[PDB]
Amino acid sequence: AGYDRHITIFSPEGRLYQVEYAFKATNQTNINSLAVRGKDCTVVISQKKVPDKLLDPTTVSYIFCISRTIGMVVNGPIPDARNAALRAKAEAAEFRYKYGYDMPCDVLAKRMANLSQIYTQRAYMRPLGVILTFVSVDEELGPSIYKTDPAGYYVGYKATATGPKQQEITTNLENHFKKSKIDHINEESWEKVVEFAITHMIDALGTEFSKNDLEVGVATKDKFFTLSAENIEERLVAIAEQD
Amino acid sequence: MDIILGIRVQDSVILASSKAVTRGISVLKDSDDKTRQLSPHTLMSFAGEAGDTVQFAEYIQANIQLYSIREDYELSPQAVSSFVRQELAKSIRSRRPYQVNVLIGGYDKKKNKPELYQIDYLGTKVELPYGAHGYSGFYTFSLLDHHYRPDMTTEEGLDLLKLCVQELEKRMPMDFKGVIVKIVDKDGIRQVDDFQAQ
Amino acid sequence: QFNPYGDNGGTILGIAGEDFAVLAGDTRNITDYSINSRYEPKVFDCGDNIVMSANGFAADGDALVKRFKNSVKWYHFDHNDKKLSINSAARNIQHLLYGKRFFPYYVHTII
Amino acid sequence: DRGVSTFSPEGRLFQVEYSLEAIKLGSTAIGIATKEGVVLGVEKRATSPLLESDSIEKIVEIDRHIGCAMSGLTADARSMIEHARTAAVTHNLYYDEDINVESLTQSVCDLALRFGEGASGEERLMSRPFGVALLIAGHDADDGYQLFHAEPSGTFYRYNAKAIGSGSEGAQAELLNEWHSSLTLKEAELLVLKILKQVMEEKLDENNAQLSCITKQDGFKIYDNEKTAELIKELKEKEAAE
Amino acid sequence: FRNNYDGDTVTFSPTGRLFQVEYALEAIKQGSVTVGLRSNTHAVLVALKRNADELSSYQKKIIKCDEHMGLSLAGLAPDARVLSNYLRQQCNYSSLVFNRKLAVERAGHLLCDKAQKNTQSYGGRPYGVGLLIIGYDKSGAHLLEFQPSGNVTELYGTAIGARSQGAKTYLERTLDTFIKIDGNPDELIKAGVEAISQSLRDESLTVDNLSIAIVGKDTPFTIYDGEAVAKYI
Amino acid sequence: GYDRALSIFSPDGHIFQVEYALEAVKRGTCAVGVKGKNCVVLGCERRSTLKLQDTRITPSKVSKIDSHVVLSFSGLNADSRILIEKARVEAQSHRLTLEDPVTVEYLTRYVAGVQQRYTQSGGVRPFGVSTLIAGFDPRDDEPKLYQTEPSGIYSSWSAQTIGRNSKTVREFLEKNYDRKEPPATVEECVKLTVRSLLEVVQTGAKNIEITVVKPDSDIVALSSEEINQYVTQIEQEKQEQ
Amino acid sequence: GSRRYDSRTTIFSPEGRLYQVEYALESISHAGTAIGIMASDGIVLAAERKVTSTLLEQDTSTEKLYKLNDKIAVAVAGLTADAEILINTARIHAQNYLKTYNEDIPVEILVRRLSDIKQGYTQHGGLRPFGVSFIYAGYDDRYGYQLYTSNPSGNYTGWKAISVGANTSAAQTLLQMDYKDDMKVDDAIELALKTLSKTTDSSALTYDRLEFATIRKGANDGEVYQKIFKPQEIKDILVKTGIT
Amino acid sequence: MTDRYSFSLTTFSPSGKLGQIDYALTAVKQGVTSLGIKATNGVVIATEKKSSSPLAMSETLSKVSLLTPDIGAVYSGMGPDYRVLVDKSRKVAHTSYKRIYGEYPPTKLLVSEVAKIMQEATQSGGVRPFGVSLLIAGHDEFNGFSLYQVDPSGSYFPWKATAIGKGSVAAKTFLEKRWNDELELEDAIHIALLTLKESVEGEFNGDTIELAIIGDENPDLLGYTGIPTDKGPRFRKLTSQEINDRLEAL
Amino acid sequence: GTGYDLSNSVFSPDGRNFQVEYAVKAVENGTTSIGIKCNDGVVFAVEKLITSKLLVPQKNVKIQVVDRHIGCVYSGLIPDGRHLVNRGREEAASFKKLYKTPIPIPAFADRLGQYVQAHTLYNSVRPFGVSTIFGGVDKNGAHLYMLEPSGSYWGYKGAATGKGRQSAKAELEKLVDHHPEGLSAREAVKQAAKIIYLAHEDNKEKDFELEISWCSLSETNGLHKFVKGDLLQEAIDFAQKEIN
């Protein structure tokens, strides 16, 4: 009887508690992230928290370069995050080898969503306690954000956020898009899109950031890259000369 | 190649099978029974490669006997021959095929008609009024094409065989040491003991 | 093509006396018309008062002697240190050899 | 539930311990070791007079120089006997000699712990331990007449005398007093028959008990009912005499 | 508490304990006492063998692994058989492939690793035996202690089994003496026999009761039983 | 894949799954076997929970394993088919390799071995079946009767019964079967079988079937009337007293 | 590990019954009733559709009566999907037999084999049994018309008349009451319908809530015909027997 | 490692229920309403695109999926479960049919295959039933137009019209009142659009509604010309614009 | 309800895997061990409790080399630690065989990461009862790492685990502040010795033995080596002096 909460079998209410608690695990790191689309770029911002002084801050990341074109940011504990990363890299490599073109952002999302679906149905595999946000400038769909969860759900976004204060960031962004009446940030240079993303991150979280409180990934035509501390400092300086 | 002959008359099937077993330079036996009773009304004669011959026969025998006990029923000659055919057709494409040719003679108690099936090691089956394997048919098929009638009695079929054996004993190069003859009719399978000087 | 066999030449000799036995062999090892060694022992003490030689293809010879030595070691382990009688060694050797019936050790062995 | 190879807090294997309780419920078996041979006797214990007593086979031959008696779930002994016969015959094929009784026993005891739901070591494919104990008796040139007690724990002890089954504690105390290093085979036969009579729930006769021995000269033989009947006449008379 | 976490080896208790492993360790303390000790030229095993009845044999406690290595057991005998057999193989593989006698230290590492697997997987159980390994190799005399937890430890002397703490205290106290007992085998055994008796209670150690093993410089691993140990009583 | 140990020991030394397998036998319709001087007779009862059956094609309770050996059973019907099949296969295999049909004891040892195996293999439950196996060894004319149970224990019986109310019918048989003087005739052996069955069935024309096995593969199952004649003669032995 | 979550589908109760079988039978007892009647000149299969709606396409619908062979058909009581698994393997077994022997499979042989599959799920493998009971209606040249039944236990028996599914106790009483050995198919068709009409958990027996099959030696051939009745054909036969 | 769950997770309870199947059906009840209606010259399937955020792009998530050029599917219950079944359904349509008879399977047989996949998840070791009900609409030469419902048990039934999910009972009723055997395809689209309005709470337009038809052949949607016998898929998704054009005459 | 802590891969209602957290308790129950990164390498050190005079000193070595350039030390269940290094050694062999170059330290860290993470994915295995500090020199410098029973790892400037982790972690924090210009290999060896003497206070009941190893571009030529003889004594002395 009581074991319908230990494995991924249905509860009388038609629920899967293990999947629900997996969602709970995604907020364990207490970090928020958000993603936006430029005219021809895609930006991902994520909080960076280095409590321990003993750590080497350069190895403390939750963003991943999946391929030359695809970036992934993870909300959830680092071990499950790296597990998902390794797999997605192996999948992106394999796809290229077998089909002769680069795996699209949405397709890799779907693939990872399907893998998570399996853990949802088979009892020996636990769900991973992670939400995965995939970003790129797809050669067909343009700037792309695709996000998967421990239920095996996935969908494309105009913009998105994930983490403890997800709802605050979401509404903030929604409010900008009702006003602008368009589905992206009308900006030619990724630098200004990064700046927009940080700005709205600040407004919704009510917090100021130094160069070491964030982590930025940018995806362009044919590259995905991460910004350095100094790259971010340059961004933070520019937003200040405006307020 | 052993002489394996079969003829189907009015009310029975008769099988004649050579008694010699020869290995290289020596005739080792002159009393070999190249035959297995598959069921009370079905008989199988066989010729071919040295070991495969009895191994395959005894294996088919085992299978039919098992079926008889499970179902408390005797399979028709047609059903038995199809089973045998499929077994040989499996064999031909396996790692080491059974190199065995068979004649199946049975009396179908349901229809009250005798039946003779010729099947080679490839699993080629045909139903015939008379049949042979190997070189035998090269001498006998023309005798039988001539003297055979569908309404012949058992006694008539035996005289026709005697003729076939005489032709084989005149024109064939190997001494096959006479034949054992068996009759399959409504009453079962019996062995003609008097063929050495009939 | 690859030929897994060679011939290291080499001759051995066993004579049984009333209360003793000898196993002798030459010490020459060869390949075609060359000498590989003028002193490569080919008769070995195997323990339990048993001497053995497997003459022919040296690589096969060495494996067999090696494998029978290890058989004596385990006989002791598995049967409370019992002495392996000569007749029991003989029978054991049969099985070692016959285990390679379809890829034989190319040796003539005397114990 | 709980794994079939689980330790108790006292450091014993549950399933093995419970297996011993099954042994306790079995028919009695006794062995005596002498310098003239080793006797093995058992209690047939038919569950009904309609059962044909001589079809109860609780003393079996393993090889000419080795026999054994069983107690507990006797159905479990069949594949143990089978392994035992194979081990002995195989040894003779490989070595042109008789297997040592100790070696044969160790081989049987090797089977014992090969149970589990997939234990990380080798392949133990057997769902539970055996529910039968074994008295293995025989002779070899090195170590003479021998008696072993082989348990489903995989351990085996050598005994001068030993009793297993329902009447074992009683029979063992009796064996403790009666055994000495100078019994004769005839004394040993009478002694087994006597002690069986004490612990048996029927009146011992040639039908409901069976004797057997192993001697270097004649090997292992099961005594037919006539011979045992006479030994019982003989024991009844030697006891009535005092 | 304890009731809920001792079901299998694959389960941690809330304090970080593995109860099945602890229970396996219990099987050892229920086992008869054995002692190991070494100088710089020899290593010795002394074992007290235990009977079932006055009619029974005293069950063997010392197993040879190679000409230069062997061990004494306390706990489940069959598990000693499994592990010593694995050790026989590893010693053997070393001789065949490399023409190298296997280092006692390395034998220790292999035993540790084999035992460890059985403490991390479902369906399996820990070993229920402690082992004292002695050997002479290219770095001299050695004594190791094996625990089914997978902990292997090199020592000058030690004891495991029922009332083992007696002999272990004696050995700790006698340390500076026996470690020098070089070139003299009989005295090393004497120091072992005097160690094991510090754990006696039920009974003296008799002829068919004592078991002694010795390995060293020019002495292959050999077992002494009966009349052969009589001169040490 | 599935290898859960289902037959395991409990603290009092019992294997409960084997023990409960016996309870399924106690629930099966009664079966009895008696041996004569020159025959063996097998009798089985038919249940009457549902009656509208076709008797022609309903699998009957006594099975031929070879032409000289027969098997009957109490317990789960489905479980018994598997044992019947394996026994039939072994019979043919034995003839094929040994060039001799099975002895009754050999066949019994085989079936019992199979049952034992299902008491100590992961992923399987024991057979809910106990068997009576009877017939004559090749070329022997000494009758043979054996019994097997879920544990894999087997033994031979002068007479034996299994299934529901076997306690009752065993009592009858224990004080009606004289080992000194087996029913020397086929007829009086069939009579003793029907008598022992009537202590339990309570009025059985269509509820009793009988099979007679004599040496050299002589096996025949009786009809209702041939049985009904035995029912008539037995009831009149009481009434004339 | 896994053991914790193992229901243990193939064990005996302390009383020697098989839990999952008993509970499977319990499931079947809620399925639309199916009835088979055997005559001298053929067999009748009648089954009640469990639950209906105006929008159920009965034209294309099949849920109780399946063709296995040309000579053998079944009626299903229980889980439809579980039954389809078994149906498909039964169809293959028939073709395997025909290929091997060049003769159509005797009815019992096919029934025994399906019962054996069922039996396996009862003794090994740790899986739930199929929640299905079959009525088999067939013809062969050994025994003629035959009627069999099999349930989750993997036991099978032959019948003159029988019902599976819901209300079998009530239905068996009625069949036993009106059945006679010298029955003709046409009478048997009537009996099958009458019985269902008195046992339905629904108001009145309409055509759109039935499936009907006959196996007859139709006297115009001197070969055996399987007829799976169309909706209009059930509608007609319903009128003639006086149920309109 | 190794999947050691080789036992069933769906078993019979003493009442004869299969719990996990019931529970799967309960999950299906929670799902957004979807429906199918059969016309004389077509079938229509429809559902609501319940957007989980207005930042999400609803178009990127298709609830209505092509299975073959003449067969489409829609669902209610767990979206991720559906998505994998659609993958296996497309594949099985090939491996078990197109690769054997060189043509796409008829609706009843593709349905039969899906039903098999779901039944297996009801019995196989170490899994839970699928938490979806499918509605599969299609055409084939010999059967014409046909609508099927597949449930977590693997049972399927042909419908003239039906609905599953949240407002199934209510919508099933409304279909009974409006369905006849003479409906044209447009008549059915209209009736579908009416039925779906009662189910949605918020916005009701061509961006929220996903609706597809199985109708006439679409030579314009083939991609090539030259084989006269290929005249074009019968499956067609209606565009956002196509929906709204009909909602005005509502 | 409860029972969430009885099985390995199971999420508690607060998104935690309790079985892993219980493993962490086994780690905290262990001896203390540390890692210090320096200007061109890494230094490893561990406490070795003298259970008895009978332990042969300098013999029961606990620090392990992987390949030729990687050091690994751990706290907790020692057998579990060994198991992890065995896998680490295979993982390095496999990388070198295919790519020729010896495995980069980050790359090595993830191999261990994924393997440890794998043992938190199923209920058929138990998580690792160790925290492992490891690192070495590669193409682009020195790297230090600590890996938790959950599979969590990060790069560290200094690292500590076991009974005296707090003391050690405190001392480590001091050096990072006072030496922003980057400790040397020589100094780190001394400092390491001190840190272990100062974490021994939280275990001061049983004497102990010190064990140091290091991997330094200038001092060891990038190869992992143990600190022995003269340089070991000097470091004990440096520590023993500042305990007073």
I31 catalytic per annotation: yes
Contact in structure between H222 and H232 (CB atoms under 8 Å): yes
Amino acid at B132: A
Return the number of CB contacts < 8 Å for F and H. 7
Q: Does the beta carbon of G244 lie under 8 angstroms from any beta carbon of chain I? A: no
Collapsing DSSP states into helix, strand and coil, what is residue C77?
A: helix
Amino acid at H152: P
How crowded is residue C76: how many other Cβ atoms within 10 Å of its Cβ?
16
Contact in structure between A112 and A91 (CB atoms under 8 Å): yes
Contact in structure between E70 and E135 (CB atoms under 8 Å): yes
CB-closest option in F15, F119, F159 to D50: F159
Place of tokens 């137009």: H145
Q: Measured between CA atoms, how close is G127 to chain I, in angstroms?
A: 20
- Residues A121 and A135: their CA atoms lie apart, in Å, by 27
A187 CB-contact burial (10 Å; exposed 0-12 / middle 13-18 / buried 19+) = middle
User: In what helix (H) or strand (E) does residue H236 lie, and over which residues does it extend?
Assistant: strand H235-237
Task: Give chain H's length.
Answer: 250
Domain holding H78, by residue range, is 1-250
- Residues A92 and A111: their CA atoms lie apart, in Å, by 10
User: Is chain I in touch with chain A: ≥3 Cβ pairs within 8 A?
Assistant: yes
Which residue in chain G is spatially nearest to E123 when comparing CA positions?
G1
Cα distances from F175 to residues D46, D80, F178, H241, in angstroms, run: 17, 38, 8, 96
In degrees and rounded to multiples of 5, residue F185 shows phi and psi of: -120, 150
Residues in chain G within 8 Å Cβ distance of I7:
4
Q: Do E96 and C73 touch (CB under 8 A)?
A: no
- Residues I104 and I142: their CA atoms lie apart, in Å, by 10
Collapsing DSSP states into helix, strand and coil, what is residue A40?
A: coil
Return the number of CB contacts < 8 Å for E and G. 5
CATH class of the structural domain E1-233: alpha beta
Cα distances from H122 to residues A14, A121, H76, H138, I198, in angstroms, run: 15, 11, 18, 26, 61
CA E198 to chain centre: 18
- Residues B77 and B181: their CA atoms lie apart, in Å, by 19
Contact in structure between A36 and A198 (CB atoms under 8 Å): no
- Residues H48 and H37: their CA atoms lie apart, in Å, by 16
Place of tokens 């130094």: A210
Q: Measured between CA atoms, how close is G129 to chain I, in angstroms?
A: 27
Residues in chain B within 8 Å Cβ distance of G100:
82-83, 86
Compute, in degrees rounded to 10, the torsion defined by CA atoms D57, D61, D67, D69.
Answer: -20
Rg (CA), chain E: 18
- Residues A83 and A90: their CA atoms lie apart, in Å, by 11
Interface test with F, best of G123, G133, G139, G155 (most F CBs within 10 A): G123
CA-based diameter of chain B, in Å? 48
List domains and CATH numbers for chain G: 1-244 (3.60.20.10)
Contact in structure between A5 and I1 (CB atoms under 8 Å): yes
Residues in chain I within 8 Å Cβ distance of A58:
155
- Residues H176 and H196: their CA atoms lie apart, in Å, by 14
Q: Do I78 and E15 touch (CB under 8 A)?
A: no
How crowded is residue B152: how many other Cβ atoms within 10 Å of its Cβ?
20
Q: Do G102 and B82 touch (CB under 8 A)?
A: yes
Q: Does the beta carbon of I112 lie under 8 angstroms from any beta carbon of chain A? A: no
Q: What is the DSSP code (8-state) at residue I17? A: -
E188 CB-contact burial (10 Å; exposed 0-12 / middle 13-18 / buried 19+) = buried
Q: Give strand pairing partners of H35.
A: H46, H163
Compute, in degrees rounded to 10, the torsion defined by CA atoms I108, I112, I117, I119.
Answer: 160
G-contacting chains (≥3 CB pairs under 8 Å)? A, B, E, F, H, I
**Residue G129, both tokens:** 């049994």
Q: Does the beta carbon of A6 lie under 8 angstroms from any beta carbon of chain G? A: yes
Q: Measured between CA atoms, how close is H24 to chain G, in angstroms?
A: 16
Compute, in degrees rounded to 10, the torsion defined by CA atoms G64, G65, G66, G71.
Answer: 150
Contact in structure between F22 and F163 (CB atoms under 8 Å): no
> Tell me, what CATH number does H20's domain have?
3.60.20.10
Contact in structure between G2 and H1 (CB atoms under 8 Å): no
Rg (CA), chain B: 16
Q: Does the beta carbon of I149 lie under 8 angstroms from any beta carbon of chain E? A: no
User: In what helix (H) or strand (E) does residue A44 lie, and over which residues does it extend?
Assistant: strand A41-47
- Residues G191 and G177: their CA atoms lie apart, in Å, by 10
Name the experimental technique: X-ray
Q: Do G4 and I124 touch (CB under 8 A)?
A: no
Q: G21 CB contacts (<8 Å, ≥6 apart)?
A: G122, G129, G151, G152, G153
User: Is chain A in touch with chain B: ≥3 Cβ pairs within 8 A?
Assistant: no
Q: Does the beta carbon of D48 lie under 8 angstroms from any beta carbon of chain F? A: yes
Contact in structure between B155 and B185 (CB atoms under 8 Å): no
Q: Measured between CA atoms, how close is I225 to chain E, in angstroms?
A: 19
Residues in chain A within 8 Å Cβ distance of H22:
12
Q: Do A3 and G4 touch (CB under 8 A)?
A: yes
Q: How many Å from the N-terminal Cα to the C-terminal Cα in chain B?
A: 25
CA E227 to chain centre: 23
CA F24 to chain centre: 15
Which residue in chain G is spatially nearest to F53 when comparing CA positions?
G159
Q: What is the DSSP code (8-state) at residue H59? A: G
Q: B47 CB contacts (<8 Å, ≥6 apart)?
A: B1, B2, B3, B4, B17, B34, B53, B100, B101, B133, B134
Contact in structure between G128 and G121 (CB atoms under 8 Å): yes
- Residues D104 and D95: their CA atoms lie apart, in Å, by 14
Collapsing DSSP states into helix, strand and coil, what is residue F89?
A: helix
Contact in structure between I61 and I44 (CB atoms under 8 Å): no
Q: Do E123 and G2 touch (CB under 8 A)?
A: no
Domain total in chain H: 1
Which residue in chain G is spatially nearest to B88 when comparing CA positions?
G100
- Residues D159 and D162: their CA atoms lie apart, in Å, by 6
User: Into which CATH architecture does domain B1-198 fall?
Assistant: 4-Layer Sandwich (3.60)
Cα distances from F85 to residues F71, F90, G110, in angstroms, run: 11, 9, 15
Beta strands in chain I (DSSP E): 33-38, 41-49, 64-66, 70-76, 130-138, 141-147, 153-155, 158-161, 208-216, 224-226
Q: What does the angle CA I56 – CA I61 – CA I64 come to, to the nearest 5 degrees? A: 170
Interface test with D, best of E6, E53, E127 (most D CBs within 10 A): E53
**Residue I223, both tokens:** 């190869």
Q: Does the beta carbon of I206 lie under 8 angstroms from any beta carbon of chain E? A: no
Q: Do I79 and E113 touch (CB under 8 A)?
A: yes
In degrees and rounded to multiples of 5, residue E71 shows phi and psi of: -150, 155
Residues in chain B within 8 Å Cβ distance of G109:
71
User: Mapped to the 3 state alphabet, what secondary structure does chain B carry?
Assistant: CCCEEEEECCCCEEEEEECCEEECCEEEECCCCCEEEEECCEEEEEEECCCHHHHHHHHHHHHHHHHHHHHCCCCCHHHHHHHHHHHHHHHHCCCCCCCEEEEEEEEECCCCEEEEEEECCCCCEEECCEEEECCHHHHHHHHHHHHCCCCCCHHHHHHHHHHHHHHHHHHCCCCCCCEEEEEEECCEEEEECCCCCC
> Tell me, what CATH number does I54's domain have?
3.60.20.10
Q: Side-chain half-sphere of E155: how many Cα atoms within 13 Å?
A: 28
Q: Measured between CA atoms, how close is A153 to chain I, in angstroms?
A: 19
Domain holding I76, by residue range, is 1-244
Q: Side-chain half-sphere of E85: how many Cα atoms within 13 Å?
A: 11
Task: Give chain D's length.
Answer: 242
Q: D116 CB contacts (<8 Å, ≥6 apart)?
A: D3, D4, D5, D124, D126, E123, E124, E125
Collapsing DSSP states into helix, strand and coil, what is residue H191?
A: helix
Sheet strand arrangement including F154-156:
F62-64, F69-75, F129-135, F144-148, F154-156
**H helix intervals, H39-132:** 79-93, 99-101, 107-120
Q: Do F170 and D75 touch (CB under 8 A)?
A: no
- Residues D164 and D24: their CA atoms lie apart, in Å, by 8
- Residues G134 and G89: their CA atoms lie apart, in Å, by 14
- Residues D17 and G122: their CA atoms lie apart, in Å, by 31
Rg (CA), chain H: 19
Collapsing DSSP states into helix, strand and coil, what is residue G242?
A: coil
Residues in chain G within 8 Å Cβ distance of H176:
53-55
Contact in structure between A139 and A102 (CB atoms under 8 Å): yes
Residues 172-191, chain I: which have Cβ within 8 Å of A?
Answer: 172-173, 176-177
- Residues H217 and H227: their CA atoms lie apart, in Å, by 14
**Residue D216, both tokens:** 């270097």
List domains and CATH numbers for chain A: 1-243 (3.60.20.10)
Contact in structure between F197 and F43 (CB atoms under 8 Å): yes
List domains and CATH numbers for chain F: 1-241 (3.60.20.10)
B192 CB-contact burial (10 Å; exposed 0-12 / middle 13-18 / buried 19+) = middle
Q: Do H4 and I124 touch (CB under 8 A)?
A: yes
**Helix pair angle (D168-178, D185-199), 10° resolution:** 150
Interface test with E, best of C70, C73, C75, C79 (most E CBs within 10 A): C73
User: Mapped to the 3 state alphabet, what secondary structure does chain E carry?
Assistant: CHHHCCCCCCCCCCCCCCHHHHHHHHHHHCCCCEEEEECCCEEEEEEECCCCCCCECCCCCEEEEECCEEEEEEECHHHHHHHHHHHHHHHHHHHHHHCCCCCHHHHHHHHHHHHHHCCCECCCCCCCEEEEEEEEECCEEEEEEECCCCCEEEECEEEECCCHHHHHHHHHHCHHHHCCCCCCHHHHHHHHHHHHHHHCCCCCCCCCCEEEEEEECCEEEEEEEHHHHHHHC
Nearest residue to B121 via CA among B88, B94, B93: B88
Q: Do F13 and D129 touch (CB under 8 A)?
A: no
Nearest residue to G196 via CA among G177, G175, G214: G175
Which residue in chain G is spatially nearest to A5 when comparing CA positions?
G5
**Residue B91, both tokens:** 């064999």
Q: What is the DSSP code (8-state) at residue A67? A: S
Contact in structure between F181 and F32 (CB atoms under 8 Å): no
Could you say which of I2, I31, I101, I120 is catalytic?
I31
- Residues C51 and C43: their CA atoms lie apart, in Å, by 7
Domain holding D213, by residue range, is 1-242
Which residue in chain G is spatially nearest to B75 when comparing CA positions?
G101
Beta pairing, strands B113-119 & A223-226: unpaired
Contact in structure between D169 and E92 (CB atoms under 8 Å): no
Compute, in degrees rounded to 10, the torsion defined by CA atoms D9, D11, D13, D14.
Answer: -30
Which residue in chain G is spatially nearest to F27 when comparing CA positions?
G16
Amino acid at G37: I
Q: What does the angle CA D173 – CA D178 – CA D181 come to, to the nearest 5 degrees? A: 125
CA I177, I179, I182, I186 torsion: positive or negative?
negative
- Residues A234 and A238: their CA atoms lie apart, in Å, by 7
Nearest residue to A120 via CA among H27, E120, E10: H27
Q: Side-chain half-sphere of I14: how many Cα atoms within 13 Å?
A: 6
- Residues H191 and E118: their CA atoms lie apart, in Å, by 66
- Residues B108 and H123: their CA atoms lie apart, in Å, by 46
Return the number of CB contacts < 8 Å for B and F. 22
- Residues F171 and C81: their CA atoms lie apart, in Å, by 59
3-state helix, strand, coil in chain H (%, to 5): 35, 25, 40
Contact in structure between C58 and C105 (CB atoms under 8 Å): no
Task: Kindly provide the resolution of this structure in angstroms, with one decimal.
Answer: 2.7
3-state helix, strand, coil in chain D (%, to 5): 35, 25, 35
Q: Does the beta carbon of F137 lie under 8 angstroms from any beta carbon of chain B? A: no
